[PDB]
Design a protein around this nucleic acid. Structure first.
Lengths: 63, 102, 195, 128, 148, 50
RNA sequence: UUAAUUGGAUUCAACGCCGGGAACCUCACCGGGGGCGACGGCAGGAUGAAGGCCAGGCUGAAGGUCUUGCCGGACGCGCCGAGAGGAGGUGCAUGGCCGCCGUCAGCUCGUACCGUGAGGCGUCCACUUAAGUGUGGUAACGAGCGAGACCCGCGCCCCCAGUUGCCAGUCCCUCCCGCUCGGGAGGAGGCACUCUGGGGGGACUGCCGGCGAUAAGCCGGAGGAAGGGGCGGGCGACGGUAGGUCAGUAUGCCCCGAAACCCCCGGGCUACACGCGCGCUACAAUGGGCGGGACAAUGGGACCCGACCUCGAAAGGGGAAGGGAAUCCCCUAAACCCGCCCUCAGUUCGGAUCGCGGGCUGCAACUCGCCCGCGUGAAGCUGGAAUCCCUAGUACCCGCGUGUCAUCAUCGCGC
């Protein structure tokens, strides 16, 4: 099961809402920005959140 | 030349790191050659015991562990340098054994 | 053999803990700590009522000061007694308190609910209390009162939730009391705070 | 030039220098190793490297841990890494890659711990 | 060329046939009536089995250097059948290799380092590398690749 | 006559520290604990599960 | 069957299980022997022991018992209340723990709304997931436990750290041979590489293509050491099973008080025409045997490991350095192959079985130990019905370490 957990899906939306201008399609850029804008200790969770906010940024401009 | 050998053994990793850092910070303050803390192998005590207090049911086992860590610190002979180490506050779970090798 | 030494010290330590809990049952004993110096072994005892531990004119503690040196061979046992900063945050203290309360004939629901409400009113995040055995009949039952947020599995449950087990004695038999407390100061793995 | 090879537990340290072509395993000549299948595993990479590279460099590989097949595979690993570093050519790199992917990647396979219910026979074996 | 440059079995055979000559090596009166190890079940087949042992032992000294009796016993030990019970490994007997080593000491090829075992004298090194050079020279003609 | 004979060896020699049972006692570096007794004190000794 | 083979356990979930080692001890069985029974009351006391004691008899023996008479210098016979202890019973009296339902997707709750109510919804439907996992609809809106997250080890890189490790390189020295080119061994010599272990990075459907409402998600591809919960572990919910255990501790009720208390000797717990459970060894040619070679890891080590030396054919005996552990020991392997011998036969395999001698642990192995040398050494020549496990470093095969262990494994856990 690849299903993204509910809580990372939740936490992704408010980043996009609060600082839409600070995130791009670059995975590593979003990774640093969510690393600093949050208090995540788990690197795996950091990467998950980055990989989903990247898709959110992608969907923002596709429609 | 005379060398003083310090063995620091403890279950808690962070306490071991704290004591090692304290010795290190004492070292260059005293200006004496202090060979860096070499982390020796960590000894792993393992005990496997049946969970069931009685004999009935499936046979299941529980494996309990202790990881005891150990670091080695070699420092050079300066009475001022080796005077400042009994004054170190040492946590309970950390044990330090200091010997003197020629 | 360092290995033969460390766990021997631990053996002495929780043997002392068991014996002291057997002795300090009325004192609301909380916990122990042992620190060695060349001067002697210094024992640090946290209890819900250090006044009871001191007893009367130090008569209690002095007696104990003998036994530690006698039964367990402790060199110069220097005993100190202190109060836990929040007994409602210690699972063991509340468990023993509740077991003693049930030993006084209080209806289990009333006492358990008062204790749970008091613990929550002390700032607790999650409180579970399980009472098992003869409560309202010959046949034993298990009854659970839970309140708040309380993780029950995974490492966070093991690393953060404090457990306390006690037994309450009564004419019909023994009631087993289990208490789990979730201190508010802890944070869950998935609890992310934005800025 | 130095190179390393890991296979299961066996670890092979290889050193390559300019030389006639003498290749030694634990200081022992290559052609004399008794298990012939292991001899072929050890000989596999420099076969494709070519006799010129064979006769242009000397190699000493010392292996510890594991068994004879594991040791031979570790030496095989280290030989290929040493050759590709010494020559610094991607042609033979792709040659080995095509012949065998593990040649320059290696097998990170490890033995799973045995588990209860008749643990002696393996992680997954159980009673009848 | 050294012992390292030739197979173990061929060099052992050559050393055994060469050491048949030296009178210092002689089987004891109890040698034919004792099997080489507790783990072994049937007695040794060939009457030459003594000399190969000595030829073997010296070879070990050429490689393991300071070695005691017990380490060789572990080396020459083997797997033994326990009837219906499963097999198990056991060390070899001590007296056979002890007599072989004491004869070798009398032969002067080996010496004793107390507290560490017995090592190989320069004379034994020259003997062994001479045999190995001859064997490698032959196998160079049989196998040209060893000229490399 | 009422003194037990001194047994250095055998099951009678070793008794659990806590419960005193003559049965399974773990002696790995000096525990002297009954196998039942081990489970309730292992966390106190610092044992962790992994 | 036995005086006794102490009891529990009954398919999944009892039968290498409690027993995780029964010569004593374990011990709860049986036989015999011995000592008591806290503390109070009745009576006594000391006028002298309650306890031991020579010489004996009984007593296996034990001033236990009594003949004999001493101490002992101090308060304890007997009856009542009541004990202490109980491995004595009752796991349908209990707590705790553990198995199984079940690492299964479940269990619920605040409010709303529906039904007179028991109750229903949320928790349902299409798709997807390992999953009450998630997407859209939905008289419901939200939340909790559970799943997931989390933690441990392995997998690759970097940082640091070096008396672990190094003919890495290194000026040099000694020795062996050399085909005089060279190679090996040890020292000297350095932290290279490995290992060592504290921190960080590396993998996120991350990107391409497609499928799928374009969502959730799914499939293929590439990069990559590593792919889609990376791999393997630990974490088992509400409750049920009056599932097992009061026979490890706790503890209800009953009972036992010269015993169902305590201590000692012996036997027994091993006994067997038998059936059943799980394993061990084989039922030989990929066989059996002699010689030789390269080969690991996990853990443990002071009444210990014990290198090394010596004697013995081995079992072992003596001396013995060093080691409380990266430094010394267990330590080396087996399965593997090569050279050669025997050569398809209940025989070479197969060894049960029994006799002698020797060695080892304990005070003691006849009941009832192991090991060694010799002798005998059988059944066993491929197993119906039926059913068992496993899917990748896994299964099989191979041996090793360790728990219990003075000695006992064919056992469990781990390599």
């Amino acid at each position: 099961g690849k299903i993204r957990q509910g809580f990372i899906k939740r936490v992704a939306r408010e980043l996009v809402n609060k600082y839409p201008n600070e995130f791009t399609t670059d995975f590593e850029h979003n990774k640093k920005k969510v690393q600093e804008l949050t208090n995540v200790t788990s690197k795996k969770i950091r990467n998950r959140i980055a990989g989903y906010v990247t898709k959110l940024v992608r969907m923002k401009m596709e429609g | 030349m005379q060398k003083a050998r310090i063995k620091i053994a403890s279950t808690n990793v962070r306490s071991l790191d704290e004591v090692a850092n304290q010795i290190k910070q004492i070292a260059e303050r005293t200006g004496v050659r202090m060979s860096g803390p070499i982390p020796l192998p960590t000894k792993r005590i393992r005990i496997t015991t049946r969970k069931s207090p009685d004999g009935e049911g499936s046979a299941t086992f529980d494996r309990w562990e202790l990881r005891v860590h150990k670091r080695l610190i070699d420092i050079e002979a300066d009475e001022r340098a080796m005077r400042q180490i009994m004054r170190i506050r040492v946590p309970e779970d950390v044990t330090i054994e200091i010997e003197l090798i020629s | 053999a360092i290995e033969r030494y460390f766990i021997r010290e631990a053996v002495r330590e929780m043997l002392i803990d068991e014996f002291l809990e057997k002795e300090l049952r009325r004192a609301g004993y909380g916990g122990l700590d042992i620190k060695k110096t060349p001067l002697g072994t210094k024992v640090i005892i946290f209890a819900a009522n250090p006044g009871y531990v001191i007893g009367r004119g130090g008569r209690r503690i002095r007696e104990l000061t003998r036994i530690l040196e006698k039964q367990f061979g402790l060199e110069n046992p220097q005993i100190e007694v202190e109060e836990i900063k929040n007994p409602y945050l210690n699972a063991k203290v509340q468990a023993v308190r509740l077991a003693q309360a049930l030993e006084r004939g209080i209806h289990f629901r009333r006492a358990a609910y008062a204790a749970l409400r008091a613990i929550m009113n002390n700032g607790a995040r999650g409180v579970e209390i399980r009472l098992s055995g003869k409560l309202t009949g010959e046949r034993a039952k298990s009854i659970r009162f839970y309140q708040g947020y309380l993780a029950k599995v995974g490492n966070p449950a093991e690393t953060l939730v404090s457990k306390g087990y006690a037994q309450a004695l009564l004419k019909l038999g023994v009631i087993g009391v289990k208490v789990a407390i979730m201190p508010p100061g802890a944070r869950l793995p998935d609890e992310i705070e934005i800025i | 030039i130095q190179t390393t090879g890991k296979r299961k537990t066996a670890i092979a340290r290889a050193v390559i220098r300019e030389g006639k072509g003498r290749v030694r395993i634990n200081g022992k000549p290559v052609e004399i190793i008794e298990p012939e299948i292991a001899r072929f595993t050890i000989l596999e990479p420099l076969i494709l490297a070519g006799e010129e590279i064979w006769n242009s460099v000397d190699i000493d590989v010392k292996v510890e841990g594991g068994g004879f097949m594991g040791q031979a595979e570790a030496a095989r690993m280290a030989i290929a890494r040493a050759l590709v570093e010494w020559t610094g050519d991607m042609s033979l790199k792709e040659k080995f890659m095509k012949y065998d992917r593990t040649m320059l990647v290696g097998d990170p396979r490890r033995t799973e711990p045995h588990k209860p219910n008749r643990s002696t026979k393996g992680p997954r074996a159980k009673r009848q | 060329a050294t012992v390292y440059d030739v197979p173990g079995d061929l060099l052992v055979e050559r050393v055994a046939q060469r050491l048949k000559e030296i009178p210092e090596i002689k089987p004891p009166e109890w040698a034919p009536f004792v099997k080489t190890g507790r783990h072994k079940e049937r007695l040794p087949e060939q009457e030459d089995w003594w000399y190969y042992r000595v030829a073997s032992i010296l070879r070990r000294v050429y490689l393991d250097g300071p070695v005691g009796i017990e380490r060789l016993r572990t080396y020459y030990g083997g797997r033994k059948n326990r009837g219906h019970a499963p097999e198990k490994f056991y060390k070899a007997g001590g007296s056979i290799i002890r007599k072989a080593l004491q004869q070798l000491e009398a032969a002067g090829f080996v010496e004793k380092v107390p507290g560490k075992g017995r090592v190989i004298t320069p004379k034994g090194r020259s003997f062994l590398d001479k045999i190995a050079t001859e064997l490698k020279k032959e196998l160079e003609e049989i196998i040209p690749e060893l000229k490399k | 006559y009422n003194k037990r004979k001194p047994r250095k060896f055998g099951k009678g020699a070793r008794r659990c520290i806590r419960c005193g049972q003559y049965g399974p006692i773990i002696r790995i570096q000096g525990l002297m604990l009954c196998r039942h007794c081990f489970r309730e004190v292992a966390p106190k000794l610092g044992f962790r599960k992994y």
